[PDB]
């Protein structure tokens, strides 16, 4: 499909932009990537142990905030040059089966 999200992934505050990347409510363990122009900005992986302890792996630095249904990335210091296509690349690890989905949008205009 086009890769278009059925919502607007962009919430506007004064400084920068909040990119909302949603995932199904049943998903327990996943990896969420933010992509600008096919290039990775942020990499977020949520896993859980046998004692229900949650580990949040985020190697590239990026201000992220998690909910039980969504993941918000926060971008700052935005000029006109950063107007581009942005994508949520979701990899589901738990529950099965393994599934990769992509939603997306255009930021400015």
């Amino acid at each position: 499909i086009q890769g278009s999200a059925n919502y607007e992934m962009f919430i506007f505050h004064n400084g920068g932009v909040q990119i909302l990347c949603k995932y199904p409510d049943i998903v327990q363990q996943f990896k969420m990537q933010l992509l600008k122009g096919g290039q990775i900005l942020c990499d977020l992986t949520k896993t859980k142990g046998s004692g229900n302890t949650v580990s949040i792996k985020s190697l590239k630095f990026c201000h992220s905030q998690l909910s039980n249904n969504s993941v918000s990335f926060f971008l700052y210091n935005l000029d006109h040059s950063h107007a581009n296509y942005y994508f949520c690349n979701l990899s589901i690890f738990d529950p099965p089966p393994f599934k990769v989905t992509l939603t997306g949008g255009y930021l400015h205009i």
Partner: antibody
Framework: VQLVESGGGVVRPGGSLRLSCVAS????????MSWVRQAPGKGLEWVSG????????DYSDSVKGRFTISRDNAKNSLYLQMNSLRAEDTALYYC?????????????????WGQGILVTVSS | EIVLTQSPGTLSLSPGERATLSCRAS???????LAWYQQKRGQAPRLLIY???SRATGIPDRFSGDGSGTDFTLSISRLEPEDFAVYYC?????????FGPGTKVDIKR
């Protein structure tokens, strides 16, 4: 990709052994690892599991006080330290990783590497 | 712990025939965390099925399966000569993760 597995052999009860699985051409931080053993002529027994950074581990009760799973991602190495060895620890030890590279050892499918490391504990 | 038994102990079939292997649990196991592995002589186990019904990457479509709660099934649509091996079911729902005793498929004569 090439996997080097070592550390096993013949040991007396009470001795020690450090098993090691080293992988060359893969990103180590993506996979949670685990150790599963097979006694001679028997089935499979899950021994231990560890997540991507080693901050989360789990053990079966049969080895909980004696074995230590660990990893060194910079060296792409997975270690099983084995102390207080018993004759019933004699087995072939396989190292395994979660199939889809989640970094978790829990509630994810696992697949096995190499041929196994033979450990024989005898007096 | 959750004890897994397998039926039958030994399966005696001819090449090209279809095979049905059964796994039963001592208590209800989540459908999402049951796997079937194949082991040939001298080889390490090989992940065939995960999530009761999802087929691992690179596994031929002749392997399928399903099940729920207490009972699960691995179906092999036609027996290739490499398939006369041992098959384990594996639960990773509740720690410790346990395996069945295994089912061997041997040549019938």
């Amino acid at each position: 990709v090439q996997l080097v597995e070592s550390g096993g052999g013949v040991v007396r009860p009470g001795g020690s052994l450090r098993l090691s699985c080293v992988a060359s051409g893969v990103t180590f931080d993506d996979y949670g690892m685990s150790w599963v053993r097979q006694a001679p002529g028997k089935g499979l027994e899950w021994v231990s599991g560890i997540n991507w950074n080693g901050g989360d581990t789990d053990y079966s009760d049969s080895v909980k006080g004696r074995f230590t799973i660990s990893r060194d991602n910079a060296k792409n190495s997975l270690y099983l330290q084995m102390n207080s060895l018993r004759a019933e620890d004699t087995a072939l030890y396989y190292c395994a990783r979660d199939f889809y590279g989640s970094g978790s050892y829990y509630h994810v499918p696992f697949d096995y590497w190499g041929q196994g490391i033979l450990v024989t504990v005898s007096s | 712990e959750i004890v897994l038994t397998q039926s039958p102990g030994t399966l005696s079939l001819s090449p090209g025939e279809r095979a049905t292997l059964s796994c039963r649990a001592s208590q209800s196991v989540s459908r999402s965390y049951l796997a079937w592995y194949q082991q040939k002589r001298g080889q390490a186990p090989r992940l065939l099925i995960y999530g009761a019904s999802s087929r691992a990457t690179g596994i031929p479509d002749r392997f399928s399966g399903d099940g729920s709660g207490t009972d699960f099934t691995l179906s092999i649509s036609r027996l290739e000569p490499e398939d006369f091996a041992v098959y384990y079911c594996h639960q990773y729902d509740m720690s410790p993760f346990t395996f069945g005793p295994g089912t061997k498929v041997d040549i019938k004569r």
